[PDB]
mmCIF file with all atom_site columns, all heavy atoms in Angstrom:
data_model
loop_
_atom_site.group_PDB
_atom_site.id
_atom_site.type_symbol
_atom_site.label_atom_id
_atom_site.label_alt_id
_atom_site.label_comp_id
_atom_site.label_asym_id
_atom_site.label_entity_id
_atom_site.label_seq_id
_atom_site.pdbx_PDB_ins_code
_atom_site.Cartn_x
_atom_site.Cartn_y
_atom_site.Cartn_z
_atom_site.occupancy
_atom_site.B_iso_or_equiv
_atom_site.pdbx_formal_charge
_atom_site.auth_seq_id
_atom_site.auth_comp_id
_atom_site.auth_asym_id
_atom_site.auth_atom_id
_atom_site.pdbx_PDB_model_num
ATOM 1  N N   . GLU A 1 2   ? 0.087   155.455 -11.066 1.00 0.00 ? 4   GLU A N   1
ATOM 2  C CA  . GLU A 1 2   ? 0.467   156.034 -9.721  1.00 0.00 ? 4   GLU A CA  1
ATOM 3  C C   . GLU A 1 2   ? 1.977   156.155 -9.387  1.00 0.00 ? 4   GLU A C   1
ATOM 4  O O   . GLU A 1 2   ? 2.368   156.787 -8.383  1.00 0.00 ? 4   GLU A O   1
ATOM 5  C CB  . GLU A 1 2   ? -0.358  155.420 -8.551  1.00 0.00 ? 4   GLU A CB  1
ATOM 6  C CG  . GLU A 1 2   ? -0.470  156.302 -7.261  1.00 0.00 ? 4   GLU A CG  1
ATOM 7  C CD  . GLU A 1 2   ? -1.572  157.381 -7.321  1.00 0.00 ? 4   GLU A CD  1
ATOM 8  O OE1 . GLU A 1 2   ? -2.768  157.005 -7.513  1.00 0.00 ? 4   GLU A OE1 1
ATOM 9  O OE2 . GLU A 1 2   ? -1.234  158.603 -7.148  1.00 0.00 ? 4   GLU A OE2 1
ATOM 10 N N   . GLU A 1 13  ? 7.867   165.692 -20.240 1.00 0.00 ? 15  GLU A N   1
ATOM 11 C CA  . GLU A 1 13  ? 8.063   167.052 -19.886 1.00 0.00 ? 15  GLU A CA  1
ATOM 12 C C   . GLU A 1 13  ? 9.523   167.426 -20.101 1.00 0.00 ? 15  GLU A C   1
ATOM 13 O O   . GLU A 1 13  ? 9.895   168.569 -19.950 1.00 0.00 ? 15  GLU A O   1
ATOM 14 C CB  . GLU A 1 13  ? 7.481   167.386 -18.509 1.00 0.00 ? 15  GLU A CB  1
ATOM 15 C CG  . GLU A 1 13  ? 6.519   168.618 -18.642 1.00 0.00 ? 15  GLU A CG  1
ATOM 16 C CD  . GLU A 1 13  ? 5.541   168.825 -17.474 1.00 0.00 ? 15  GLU A CD  1
ATOM 17 O OE1 . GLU A 1 13  ? 5.497   167.983 -16.544 1.00 0.00 ? 15  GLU A OE1 1
ATOM 18 O OE2 . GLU A 1 13  ? 4.808   169.851 -17.506 1.00 0.00 ? 15  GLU A OE2 1
ATOM 19 N N   . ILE A 1 28  ? 14.332  183.761 -31.327 1.00 0.00 ? 30  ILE A N   1
ATOM 20 C CA  . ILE A 1 28  ? 15.489  184.616 -31.032 1.00 0.00 ? 30  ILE A CA  1
ATOM 21 C C   . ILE A 1 28  ? 16.392  184.734 -32.268 1.00 0.00 ? 30  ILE A C   1
ATOM 22 O O   . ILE A 1 28  ? 16.915  185.814 -32.569 1.00 0.00 ? 30  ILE A O   1
ATOM 23 C CB  . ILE A 1 28  ? 16.329  184.152 -29.855 1.00 0.00 ? 30  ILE A CB  1
ATOM 24 C CG1 . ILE A 1 28  ? 15.440  183.702 -28.715 1.00 0.00 ? 30  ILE A CG1 1
ATOM 25 C CG2 . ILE A 1 28  ? 17.238  185.313 -29.361 1.00 0.00 ? 30  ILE A CG2 1
ATOM 26 C CD1 . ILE A 1 28  ? 16.035  183.990 -27.303 1.00 0.00 ? 30  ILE A CD1 1
ATOM 27 N N   . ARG A 1 50  ? 17.716  214.683 -25.114 1.00 0.00 ? 52  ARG A N   1
ATOM 28 C CA  . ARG A 1 50  ? 16.873  215.728 -24.463 1.00 0.00 ? 52  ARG A CA  1
ATOM 29 C C   . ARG A 1 50  ? 16.552  217.095 -25.236 1.00 0.00 ? 52  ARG A C   1
ATOM 30 O O   . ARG A 1 50  ? 17.412  217.641 -25.934 1.00 0.00 ? 52  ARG A O   1
ATOM 31 C CB  . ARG A 1 50  ? 17.453  216.011 -23.041 1.00 0.00 ? 52  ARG A CB  1
ATOM 32 C CG  . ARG A 1 50  ? 16.669  215.486 -21.774 1.00 0.00 ? 52  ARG A CG  1
ATOM 33 C CD  . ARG A 1 50  ? 16.604  213.942 -21.636 1.00 0.00 ? 52  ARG A CD  1
ATOM 34 N NE  . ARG A 1 50  ? 16.495  213.472 -20.246 1.00 0.00 ? 52  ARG A NE  1
ATOM 35 C CZ  . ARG A 1 50  ? 15.484  212.756 -19.740 1.00 0.00 ? 52  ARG A CZ  1
ATOM 36 N NH1 . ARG A 1 50  ? 14.424  212.403 -20.477 1.00 0.00 ? 52  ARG A NH1 1
ATOM 37 N NH2 . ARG A 1 50  ? 15.538  212.386 -18.469 1.00 0.00 ? 52  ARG A NH2 1
ATOM 38 N N   . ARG A 1 144 ? -1.462  207.611 -43.281 1.00 0.00 ? 146 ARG A N   1
ATOM 39 C CA  . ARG A 1 144 ? -2.066  208.395 -42.251 1.00 0.00 ? 146 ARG A CA  1
ATOM 40 C C   . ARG A 1 144 ? -1.206  208.278 -40.996 1.00 0.00 ? 146 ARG A C   1
ATOM 41 O O   . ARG A 1 144 ? -0.740  207.181 -40.628 1.00 0.00 ? 146 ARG A O   1
ATOM 42 C CB  . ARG A 1 144 ? -3.470  207.859 -42.070 1.00 0.00 ? 146 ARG A CB  1
ATOM 43 C CG  . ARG A 1 144 ? -4.520  208.554 -41.185 1.00 0.00 ? 146 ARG A CG  1
ATOM 44 C CD  . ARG A 1 144 ? -5.542  207.419 -41.277 1.00 0.00 ? 146 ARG A CD  1
ATOM 45 N NE  . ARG A 1 144 ? -6.924  207.586 -40.886 1.00 0.00 ? 146 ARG A NE  1
ATOM 46 C CZ  . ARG A 1 144 ? -7.768  206.550 -40.784 1.00 0.00 ? 146 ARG A CZ  1
ATOM 47 N NH1 . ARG A 1 144 ? -7.369  205.295 -41.028 1.00 0.00 ? 146 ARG A NH1 1
ATOM 48 N NH2 . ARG A 1 144 ? -9.027  206.784 -40.427 1.00 0.00 ? 146 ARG A NH2 1
ATOM 49 N N   . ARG C 2 253 ? -5.651  163.691 -10.313 1.00 0.00 ? 264 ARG C N   1
ATOM 50 C CA  . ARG C 2 253 ? -4.582  164.229 -9.437  1.00 0.00 ? 264 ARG C CA  1
ATOM 51 C C   . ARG C 2 253 ? -3.513  165.003 -10.118 1.00 0.00 ? 264 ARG C C   1
ATOM 52 O O   . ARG C 2 253 ? -3.118  164.652 -11.218 1.00 0.00 ? 264 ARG C O   1
ATOM 53 C CB  . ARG C 2 253 ? -3.913  163.100 -8.716  1.00 0.00 ? 264 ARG C CB  1
ATOM 54 C CG  . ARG C 2 253 ? -4.881  162.324 -7.942  1.00 0.00 ? 264 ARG C CG  1
ATOM 55 C CD  . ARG C 2 253 ? -4.127  161.256 -7.265  1.00 0.00 ? 264 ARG C CD  1
ATOM 56 N NE  . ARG C 2 253 ? -4.992  160.350 -6.495  1.00 0.00 ? 264 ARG C NE  1
ATOM 57 C CZ  . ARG C 2 253 ? -4.487  159.476 -5.600  1.00 0.00 ? 264 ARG C CZ  1
ATOM 58 N NH1 . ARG C 2 253 ? -3.131  159.428 -5.398  1.00 0.00 ? 264 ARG C NH1 1
ATOM 59 N NH2 . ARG C 2 253 ? -5.298  158.636 -4.906  1.00 0.00 ? 264 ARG C NH2 1
ATOM 60 N N   . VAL C 2 295 ? 14.865  188.439 -24.743 1.00 0.00 ? 306 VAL C N   1
ATOM 61 C CA  . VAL C 2 295 ? 15.090  187.071 -24.388 1.00 0.00 ? 306 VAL C CA  1
ATOM 62 C C   . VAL C 2 295 ? 14.657  186.703 -22.977 1.00 0.00 ? 306 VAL C C   1
ATOM 63 O O   . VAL C 2 295 ? 14.052  185.637 -22.770 1.00 0.00 ? 306 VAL C O   1
ATOM 64 C CB  . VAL C 2 295 ? 16.443  186.630 -24.735 1.00 0.00 ? 306 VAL C CB  1
ATOM 65 C CG1 . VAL C 2 295 ? 16.364  185.153 -25.145 1.00 0.00 ? 306 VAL C CG1 1
ATOM 66 C CG2 . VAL C 2 295 ? 16.899  187.468 -25.905 1.00 0.00 ? 306 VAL C CG2 1
ATOM 67 N N   . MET C 2 306 ? 5.030   175.174 -20.079 1.00 0.00 ? 317 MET C N   1
ATOM 68 C CA  . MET C 2 306 ? 5.308   173.859 -19.561 1.00 0.00 ? 317 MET C CA  1
ATOM 69 C C   . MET C 2 306 ? 4.396   173.592 -18.341 1.00 0.00 ? 317 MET C C   1
ATOM 70 O O   . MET C 2 306 ? 4.438   172.565 -17.666 1.00 0.00 ? 317 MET C O   1
ATOM 71 C CB  . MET C 2 306 ? 6.834   173.843 -19.339 1.00 0.00 ? 317 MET C CB  1
ATOM 72 C CG  . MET C 2 306 ? 7.445   172.949 -18.288 1.00 0.00 ? 317 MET C CG  1
ATOM 73 S SD  . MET C 2 306 ? 8.348   173.864 -16.985 1.00 0.00 ? 317 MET C SD  1
ATOM 74 C CE  . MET C 2 306 ? 7.335   173.465 -15.516 1.00 0.00 ? 317 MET C CE  1
ATOM 75 N N   . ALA C 2 454 ? -13.901 206.321 -40.108 1.00 0.00 ? 465 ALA C N   1
ATOM 76 C CA  . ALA C 2 454 ? -12.454 206.406 -40.134 1.00 0.00 ? 465 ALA C CA  1
ATOM 77 C C   . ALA C 2 454 ? -11.675 205.145 -40.456 1.00 0.00 ? 465 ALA C C   1
ATOM 78 O O   . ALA C 2 454 ? -10.650 205.218 -41.160 1.00 0.00 ? 465 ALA C O   1
ATOM 79 C CB  . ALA C 2 454 ? -11.978 207.012 -38.911 1.00 0.00 ? 465 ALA C CB  1
ATOM 80 N N   . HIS C 2 547 ? 20.247  212.077 -15.755 1.00 0.00 ? 558 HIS C N   1
ATOM 81 C CA  . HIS C 2 547 ? 19.759  213.106 -16.667 1.00 0.00 ? 558 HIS C CA  1
ATOM 82 C C   . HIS C 2 547 ? 18.250  213.258 -16.665 1.00 0.00 ? 558 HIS C C   1
ATOM 83 O O   . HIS C 2 547 ? 17.680  213.436 -17.734 1.00 0.00 ? 558 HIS C O   1
ATOM 84 C CB  . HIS C 2 547 ? 20.226  212.799 -18.096 1.00 0.00 ? 558 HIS C CB  1
ATOM 85 C CG  . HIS C 2 547 ? 21.563  212.136 -18.154 1.00 0.00 ? 558 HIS C CG  1
ATOM 86 N ND1 . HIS C 2 547 ? 21.831  210.943 -17.509 1.00 0.00 ? 558 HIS C ND1 1
ATOM 87 C CD2 . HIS C 2 547 ? 22.719  212.510 -18.756 1.00 0.00 ? 558 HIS C CD2 1
ATOM 88 C CE1 . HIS C 2 547 ? 23.096  210.618 -17.701 1.00 0.00 ? 558 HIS C CE1 1
ATOM 89 N NE2 . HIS C 2 547 ? 23.657  211.551 -18.458 1.00 0.00 ? 558 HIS C NE2 1
#
Side-chain angles (χ1 to χ4, degrees):
Chain A
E4 203 83 59
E15 233 162 356
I30 317 213
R52 253 66 152 119
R146 188 189 195 190
Chain C
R264 303 181 183 193
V306 214
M317 153 241 116
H558 327 57

